[PDB]
């Protein structure tokens, strides 16, 4: 629930002003949109180890986590390398059960099975998992003199 | 909680259920909603054995699938390497045959057409050993280099 | 690198036990030399030293510290901040306290995230979507001066300009710098372990020459203290001696 | 031979037929997801009229250009090459067919089908990617105006094939800015914390806690009902609690009005930047185009900079390395031959054969291009990497 | 993000 | 509070968030007689020297 | 405040199954106690540098830590690479002061 301006000025600028001095940094970028999500991309000059770069970036990020909004801290900030060695794609089709049920079944029964195969480096599942959703009706709250914080 | 009782529960002003987190994206395969998974190969891993193993494991797991479900592998990047290897072998055999024919046509004996056949594959194996020593891999560019050489 | 990794791991286990203020400001780790490689000044004539300090922090320091070999850059100053000077003799005529001022400032300068109208898990028949935005945040001295501390029934509110003086200023009045007697803005560059001096100085000077194009109207740069000139001259003299020796032989 | 070689088009790698084509869809700004889904379903039903395609996979709400409810993308997977070994069954032919069929069918939005390059990192035809930055934070309107002025200076009076000079972002769209009246909120018992609470709770989600769902933890989230976040008249009707629990229509506190805002924000090396794309018209070196772009940017005030991005980065640094390497190789070859023959005279007699192979290769490539283009095709061969490797091989054999 | 695509196809 | 500053919040100053700090007036923290008149309060609010 | 099974399936299982594919891995093990404590042992094959292995393990753990429970995140996950067999044992003796 953060516009591009708010997201940028409150999270991305703060995170980016501290990623200066990382050994071997070439240039960096920042992107934000109205979807409520953003990222910061740092490109390093060749001849630099990627594992060391990732660890140092994580350590640098660890010194500013206390200045970000509470929601950002609750959700957390990730750090990953853009490298990838794509191998194949797997699709599960049902036509009889909703997509969330298939997502849960795949994440709980299939994904752990393919991670133990010899030669597999990483498996990524596209889609959001389950959660307990509550849908409040403001008319009822007004009728009882309550509020969302309650 | 009221002083006289008759408290207000969470189901008087809301509707509780089980759902997702975002509701943003939506995938479909040929008109029927699906769920996709991406497999990444680890550094220093054979790309053909891994695909075969994944397919076999999926075939084994298919037995316990809920009614209606199925699986598919629309894309797989392990076929290009196999095609390149097949092309390399085909060209090697064809070159051996051509060399045999030319040497027999010009030199006019069968004792001459064995030396090149014996000596070429050894050179190729030496090149393979050197590239393995340096820490390189087997891909399309390496196969093309072998075909050229 | 491995030593720094171990140090970071050891530090991450104690941050939760340090005082609140220390955590609020954060703990920094560095690995650089302690002797200045060079000092660059930013003298001008139409801006005060606070303005030039802010400009150097915003535009110059980040550029210099992602150069190859630079281990740290120190600014003898501080960036801008909104400074509030409370008069304790006026907090008594109204029966206020510092905690009231702090709470009022923290409860009226907050950021708002509204959302979107026609959100995603929407009803059928929706055809439009719009983002919603509200500012609810202060950015000028007058706005800060008009903060409310006590409503009261009479309707005569108590503002923040009534018991304080608010204006822009530095966040830390600690250090200062001068060049030949006149105030200037300076920032010391310190090398890093396993870094060359001549190459670093050349890179710094080239980058400064490039940056000079976007300077405001009136300020200039200079580097009066540099430790690579001696190295260059020593090498030149040694080579000349080598040539003389070859000729004599 | 040298003249023929110097007039060859340049590139990195030839576009391949990987077995799939890519599709992108956009709709008018401010569209919902139901319209996007309808357009995607229409596209999916249209993709079945091409026998060269096997499976169509569509993803809604996401695209490489950006993320939003009016953006979508799909991937079409074709049958194996053997089954489609005909004239118009190539990947590019299928892409053109699909784009043409989309043009006359899609009633809401537009779609574009393309064939991705072999390696995304090294792709020809990227053109010139530019990023204007403002060094003094003038704002967004000023930077957009400067970008438009730069595009006009680069397009009409320029040499960049004006059909390609275009921006690379996302146009703005209307919004619902709210102006709160602190003076009016103070005239009553209306604080400023309750305003934020109500505004952020009405139409935005909230993450409360976790709960164990049959083995693993999962989130618990609270959102308002769908019927209360669908219309603009669902916000201004949010009366705010007073000091004594009274409600203020929030119309006397805030004023709601439509405006035009940015749906995306970008930043490059710490400065606000907006992306741009271009390409030299014809018979023009990339160096001259880059120099003209730099001079044009300098023409603007002091506070707007330029900085290349992507493939333009490796061209900014002068490509004066291949010439030096080839000269060194020639010198080494001459020295080796002089040592072998024990003379400074015969090695040049041996070195005089390079032009023969160079001319042969160049003439062959040019003739094949002419023959292909003579039957309606497009020139597919250029001065790419494989050309260099083959030339080196022929040089070695002739030597 | 990176909804169904990998590096890169679906 | 009598003699030290406090970091409270942040404000947007031309494209950057910068600190907001509160401290006593200059002349109210100059001599040692400004500590001998703190006069802290008590439970009922009456100040105690 | 967790059993030996809730911690096994909500904390340790994720870290274990996500740590597959680390270059040079030989085998793994996990242990969970009823006192809200657990560990994951990661044994590599010889001929591998310990520093590179530790860096890779830290990267893998960090890029998955954004899902674990809130209290575990607030406490933190420790990484150690040390032996388990004793070398010496030094005893302190006295008759004028107690053991505390």
Author numbering:
A (entry chain B): 51 to 200
B (entry chain B): 251 to 399
C (entry chain A): 101 to 349
D (entry chain B): 549 to 947
E (entry chain D): 2 to 11
F (entry chain A): 749 to 797
G (entry chain C): 51 to 150
From the manuscript:
To study MtrDCR103-Col interactions, we incubated 2 μM the MtrDCR103-nanodisc sample with 20 μM Col for 2 h to form the MtrDCR103-Col complex. We obtained a cryo-EM map of this complex at a 3.08-Å resolution. Similar to MtrDCR103-CASP, the structure of MtrDCR103-Col reveals an asymmetric trimer, with the three MtrDCR103 protomers exhibiting the access, binding, and extrusion conformational states. In the binding protomer of MtrDCR103, the cryo-EM map depicts an additional large density corresponding to the bound Col peptide. This bound Col molecule is found deep inside the distal drug binding site of the pump. The Col binding site overlaps that of CASP; however, it appears that MtrDCR103 utilizes a slightly different subset of residues to attach this peptide. Again, the nature of this protein-peptide interaction is mostly hydrophobic. Within 4.5 Å of this bound peptide, there are 26 residues, H46, S87, T128, S130, A132, S134, F136, I139, M141, Q172, R174, F176, S275, T277, A288, M290, P324, Y325, F568, I605, V607, F610, F612, S615, F623, and I625, that participate in facilitating Col binding. One notable difference is that some of the polar residues, such as S87, T128, S130, S134, Q172, and S615, do not interact with CASP. Presumably, these residues are more specific for Col recognition.
